């Protein structure tokens, strides 16, 4: 079952009837749900995805030029004109230049000079819009009471359901009920608005790297840009951002592009969010969610099982998690299942006074055959204790010490 | 002759004997040297070239990675080890990561994880040293004497000399004398140290674009770097400048490179000088020089030629230069050369009182045939004047007005 590895794990217990329980789901964190007379289940938000993201504007962060040309006119011989100063893809600059007898002109003074080149964008970054309608949340559920291989590994258990289940949530459909076969079902009313406002944020992509940025900063960027995308060939406005004109030759200037601004953008960006895009749909990691579970239709596997009377053995020795709980995997050699597993923690082996609670509510061996494996989770009390599993002489006990640190 | 087009033109007159006169030669500027009974000559520093420049240090301003790999060890199961964490070309990071039953490990806690990738530099900039031994200055000289096509055009016959001559100067050989055939010779004692101190400057090259930068700024660049030249494949120090490590998976991190820092450098670079490189040798434009001319062996073509008695005509109408001097092109149809050209400026046509000086020392028609071409330069006095050329009735006069505003 999920969560037992998770570090940001929240323990929550309901009441006796309960029916409803409030939870807080969050990326990188899980919620373990315990309840009196109800099976303990683990819930976790796995992904927060955006779809149908429409582009808005694209900026060019690396470009190059080609086909340089210039046209010059002597003093008092009218303005110069080059063919391509009306071409939307060419960038040009008009200027005056010193002319004399040396460079052909009959007089000395200022003459006209126009210089054009062809702008072409090698690498551009793209900004896209985020309307909260196109939001999808994936919430995964798993059930305490089955095996070990089905941990966070073997995430292929939805096809048999029972233990593991998925639910998908939308801001326009926050309700969702999830069936768990012989365990009943669970309803989920999840209020998403508490997450984060998307009315002033853009999804930025650049060289298969993604961010979330504020609108005003995006609009002010000093680079060539187009709306998009790209209607075959784009028309870049403000080509002078990356291009400039040097020199003052008799018959030409020199056009020159600025270096790739990829590093400059990367720099003034780390103070923002990150995202992925698998696939053609953005996947956020910076999320948040407040949900409400409806547990009336949740239930144990409805049999008063005859207790497991045969012998258990520890396959893996118990291990302390980061929260103090004890995990225990057991192999059972009996054939009297599906039986109720007798397991507790004793501070005294004579009276077997039940100290501490169980996290896996009512352990039951799913199979009826022998040599089956099952994992249980316990919440030990501070100090010394003994982990007792079984009945009679065929019970195994492991000494435990919970420092509580 | 040069300079007449040049805007940053300095007129300098010596004494009567003089022998030596100090001048300041500078890129984009000329010096006109006039003297009594000496031919007027134009001097200009055209290029300042550096050769044999030894590399010092190269910085990598755009890079990429490849062959990512990771190795992990369970809690208390020793440190992790990857093959290539000893390879000088790979960049690696060791770290601890959360491990539990979910991700294979028998216990919960920190486990070891090392992640390596192969650093490869796509684009690097190179800084080179400048020792004054490897310095070359090209100084061009021309003589006011005849022609017009030999302006800034037809720099082809300069090795046939007479009028045009080149000299090359080195800090290890600052003395240089230049012969001008029938005009004599000119000595040049040029002190280069006053030009520009090159003891705190590096020649920076980056993507076929070049600069001169201050040493301390070059040493401070925060990029991967290596000292020297190639050694086949380089060993980059401080690869972590462009590389960083994200994620904290059970079995790996993620390596990521920063964008090309070319734009950031371009930005924090414009506040320095610029240069070109034609070819495999640096060519500077930001220069300066103080020279001392030795004119004892300079002289007119030593004959008092019988004056040109035939008629001249103006091909080009006279033109005002940027400094107020007058250029005049004349065609001569007589065959009594090489003759002395009679030309002056008169404020009164009765007395022909010679007002204003001539810039072209002793105009002489070089050729003996007819229909020869010659250019003269005059320094007119303020107000009205008349440009008189010729003798008798077959002389042509052009009205001129130098407002001086």
């Amino acid at each position, epitope marked *: 079952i999920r969560c037992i590895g998770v570090s940001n794990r929240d323990f929550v217990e309901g009441m006796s009837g309960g029916t409803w329980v409030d939870v807080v789901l969050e990326h990188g964190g899980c919620v373990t749900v315990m309840a009196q007379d109800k099976p303990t289940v683990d819930i976790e938000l796995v992904t927060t995805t955006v779809s149908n993201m429409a582009e808005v504007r694209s900026y060019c962060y690396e470009a*190059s030029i*080609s*086909d*340089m*040309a*210039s*046209d*010059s*006119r002597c003093p008092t011989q009218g303005e*110069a004109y*080059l063919d391509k100063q009306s071409d939307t893809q060419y960038v040009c600059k008009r200027t005056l230049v010193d002319r004399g007898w040396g460079n*052909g002109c009959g007089l000395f003074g200022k003459g006209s000079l126009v210089t054009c080149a*062809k702008f*072409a964008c090698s690498k551009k970054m793209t900004g896209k819009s985020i309307q909260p309608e196109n939001l999808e949340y994936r919430i995964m559920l798993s059930v305490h009471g089955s095996q070990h291989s089905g941990m966070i590994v073997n995430d292929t258990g939805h096809e048999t359901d029972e233990n593991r289940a998925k639910v998908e949530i939308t801001p326009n459909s926050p309700r969702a009920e999830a069936t768990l076969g012989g365990f009943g079902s669970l309803g989920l009313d999840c209020e998403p608005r508490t997450g984060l406002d998307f009315s002033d944020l853009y999804y930025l992509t650049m060289n298969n790297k993604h961010w979330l940025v504020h609108k005003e900063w995006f609009h002010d960027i000093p680079l060539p840009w187009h709306a998009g995308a790209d209607t075959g060939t784009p028309h870049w406005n403000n080509k002078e951002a990356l291009v400039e004109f040097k020199d003052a*030759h008799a*018959k*030409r200037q*020199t056009v020159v592009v600025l270096g790739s601004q990829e590093g400059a953008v990367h720099t003034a960006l780390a103070g923002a969010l990150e995202a992925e895009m698998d696939g053609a749909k953005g996947r956020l990691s910076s999320g948040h969610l407040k949900c409400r579970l409806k547990m009336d239709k949740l239930r144990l596997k409805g049999v008063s099982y005859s207790l497991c009377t045969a012998a258990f053995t520890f396959t893996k020795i118990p291990a302390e998690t980061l929260h103090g709980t004890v995990t225990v995997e057991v192999q059972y050699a009996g054939t009297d299942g599906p039986c109720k597993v007798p397991a507790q923690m004793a501070v005294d082996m004579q009276t077997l006074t039940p100290v501490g609670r169980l996290i896996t509510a009512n352990p039951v061996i799913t199979e009826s055959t022998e040599n089956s494996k099952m994992m249980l989770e316990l919440d030990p009390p501070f100090g010394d204790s003994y982990i007792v599993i079984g009945v009679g002489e065929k019970k195994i006990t492991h000494h435990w010490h919970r420092s509580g640190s | 002759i040069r300079c007449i087009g040049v805007s940053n033109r300095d007129f300098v007159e010596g004494m009567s004997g003089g022998t030596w006169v100090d001048v300041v030669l500078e890129h984009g500027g000329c010096v006109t040297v006039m003297a009594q009974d000496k031919p007027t000559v134009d001097i200009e520093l055209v290029t300042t070239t550096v050769s044999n420049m030894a590399e010092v240090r190269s910085y990598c301003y755009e890079a990429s990675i490849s062959d990512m790999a990771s190795d992990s060890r369970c809690p208390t199961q020793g440190e992790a080890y990857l093959d290539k964490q000893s390879d000088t070309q790979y960049v690696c990071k060791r770290t601890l990561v959360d491990r539990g039953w979910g991700n294979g490990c028998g216990l919960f806690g920190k486990g070891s994880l090392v992640t390596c990738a192969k650093f490869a530099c796509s684009k690097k900039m190179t800084g080179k040293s400048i020792q004054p031994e490897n310095l070359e200055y090209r100084i061009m000289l021309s003589v006011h004497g005849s022609q017009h096509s030999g302006m800034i055009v037809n*720099d*082809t016959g*300069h090795e046939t000399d007479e009028n045009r001559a080149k000299v090359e100067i080195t800090p290890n050989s600052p003395r240089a004398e230049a012969t001008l055939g029938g005009f004599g010779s000119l000595g040049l004692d040029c002190e280069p140290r006053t030009g520009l101190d090159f003891s705190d400057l590096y020649y920076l090259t980056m993507n076929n674009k070049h600069w001169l930068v201050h040493k301390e700024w070059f040493h401070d660049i925060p990029l991967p770097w290596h000292a020297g030249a190639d050694t086949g494949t380089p060993h980059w120090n401080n690869k972590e400048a462009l590389v960083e490590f994200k994620d904290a998976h059970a079995k790996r991190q993620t390596v990521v490179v920063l964008g090309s820092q070319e734009g950031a450098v371009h930005t924090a670079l414009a506040g320095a000088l610029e240069a*070109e490189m*034609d*070819g*495999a040798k640096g060519r500077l434009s930001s220069g300066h020089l103080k020279c001392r001319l030795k004119m004892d062996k300079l002289r007119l073509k030593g004959v008092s030629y019988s004056l040109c008695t035939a008629a001249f005509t103006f091909t080009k109408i006279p033109a005002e230069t940027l400094h107020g001097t007058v250029t005049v092109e004349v065609q001569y149809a007589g065959t009594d050369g090489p003759c002395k050209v009679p030309a002056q400026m008169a404020v009164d046509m009765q007395t022909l009182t010679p007002v204003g000086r001539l810039i072209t020392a002793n105009p002489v028609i070089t050729e003996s045939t007819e229909n020869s071409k010659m250019m003269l330069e005059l320094d007119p006095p303020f107000g009205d004047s008349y440009i008189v050329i010729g003798v008798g009735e077959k002389k042509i006069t052009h009205h001129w007005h130098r407002s001086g505003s």
Partner: antibody
Framework: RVHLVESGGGVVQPGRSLRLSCVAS????????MHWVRQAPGKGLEWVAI????????YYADSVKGRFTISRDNSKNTLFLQMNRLRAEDTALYYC?????????????????????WGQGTLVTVSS | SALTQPASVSGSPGQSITIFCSGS?????????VSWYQQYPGKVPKLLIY???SRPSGVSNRFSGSKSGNTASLTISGLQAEDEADYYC??????????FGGGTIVTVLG
């Protein structure tokens, strides 16, 4: 009226160096972009490199990037192609050619000067 | 890197023949700077067409240059024995470079 004469061709050891020269005569060298274009015996033409009239910029084909270097002296009307780290692949006839950069007619200046005048070319054999 | 020109083109005398010169949006489709050169075997190449459709002084008007999209075409109208030769196309590039085609050999039938 327009003459271009190549020189320098011959045999060269593999992995060595050779300097090819091109002298011009009969036209204003300072206004022509100059190209090196090579052709293997019985093969198609292959553009090698360009240098502009003033030497401001030079541009090379991908096959010779970082191996060849083009340059020129306008005060001599001469064009040089320095070939380093040679290979048998580079055994070919090298034509020195020149396109005029005047477009509008003493008014315009043009980068894509086309390939007007072709020289005879000199043969470079890369054999041991 | 390469311009795709046909290998051979065959026509009877009098006929008009057409020669490929296919490239990309960054050479033929990006500019109007494609030229055509005629090379006789063992002779220096000769410029026939420049700037797509213009011909230099002293070239027969039998050679015409078209271009459409990313493909330029050379048309030889009125085929003669004199036209038996190699024909190359060249083009300026978005990389500030020039590039030639494989070349087409024109042989006159009959």
């Amino acid at each position: 009226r327009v003459h271009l004469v190549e020189s320098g061709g011959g045999v060269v050891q593999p992995g060595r160096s050779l300097r090819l020269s091109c002298v011009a005569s009969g036209f204003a060298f300072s206004n022509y972009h100059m190209h090196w274009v090579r052709q293997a015996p019985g093969k198609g033409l292959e553009w090698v490199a360009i240098i502009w009239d003033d030497g401001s910029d030079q541009y090379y084909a991908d096959s010779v990037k970082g191996r060849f270097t083009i340059s020129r002296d306008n005060s001599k009307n001469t064009l040089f192609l320095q070939m380093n780290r040679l290979r048998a692949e580079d055994t070919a006839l090298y034509y020195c050619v020149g396109g005029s950069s005047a477009y509008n007619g003493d008014n315009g200046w043009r980068e894509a000067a086309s390939l007007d005048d072709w020289g005879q070319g000199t043969l470079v054999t890369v054999s041991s | 890197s390469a311009l795709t020109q046909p290998a051979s083109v065959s026509g009877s005398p009098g006929q008009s023949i057409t020669i490929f010169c296919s490239g990309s949006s960054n050479d033929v489709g990006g500019y109007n700077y494609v030229s055509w050169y005629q090379q006789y075997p063992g002779k220096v190449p000769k410029l026939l067409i420049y700037d797509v459709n213009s011909r230099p002084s002293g070239v027969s008007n039998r050679f015409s240059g078209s271009k459409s999209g990313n493909t330029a075409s050379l048309t030889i109208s009125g085929l003669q024995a004199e036209d038996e030769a190699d024909y190359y196309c060249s083009s300026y590039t978005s990389r500030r470079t020039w590039v030639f085609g494989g070349g087409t050999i024109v042989t006159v039938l009959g």
